[PDB]
Amino acid sequence: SGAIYVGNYRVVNRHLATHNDWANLVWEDSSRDLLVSSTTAQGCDTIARCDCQTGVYYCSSRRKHYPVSFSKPSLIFVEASEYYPARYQSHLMLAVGHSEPGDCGGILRCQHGVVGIVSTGGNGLVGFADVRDLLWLDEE
Numbered sequence: 001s002g003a004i005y006v007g008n009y010r011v012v013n014r015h016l017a018t019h020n021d022w023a024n025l026v027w028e029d030s031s032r033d034l035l036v037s038s039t040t041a042q043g044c045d046t047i048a049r050c051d052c053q054t055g056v057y058y059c060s061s062r063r064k065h066y067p068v069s070f071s072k073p074s075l076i077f078v079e080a081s082e083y084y085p086a087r088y089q090s091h092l093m094l095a096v097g098h099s100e101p102g103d104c105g106g107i108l109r110c111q112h113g114v115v116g117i118v119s120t121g122g123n124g125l126v127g128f129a130d131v132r133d134l135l136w137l138d139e140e
């Protein structure tokens, strides 16, 4: 589990979104495994605006933060999970690092702030749904 709290927005894995998230929907995209809902309070997260390929991610199944190199956001074929058949998971970044299904929601961060959240994890290893293209997260 995990979310990004930026301004009055909550960014979660679409497959972990709650009823309250869907009842307060701002934007969702199945292809990206992302959903954004509204919050009453303002959030303490700075989204990165950058093309970094190095950062650190939180891995709940290790209680550890790991430094990683990651690929730029792309349309990877992702192998079937419980929540998606496979499709081309878009805006996905892959690193070499451990992950399990429950690790979805761990922040990846660079020197500029939050890059994305764990979403996928194949043999390739850990995939992070990028949020850095979502400029609108910073305004209104």
Ligand SMILES: Cc1ccc(NC(=O)[C@@H]2CCCO2)nc1
Pocket (backbone or CB within 6 Å): 079, 080, 081, 082, 099, 100, 101, 102, 103, 104, 118, 119, 120, 121, 122, 126, 127
């Ligand atoms: C971070 C992450 C996300 C998903 C997965 N696992 C899968 O997609 C499938 C489900 C059944 C066995 O593997 N592993 C890691």
Ligand SMILES: [Zn+2]
Pocket (backbone or CB within 6 Å): 048, 049, 050, 051, 052, 110, 111, 112, 113
């Ligand atoms: Zn950066």
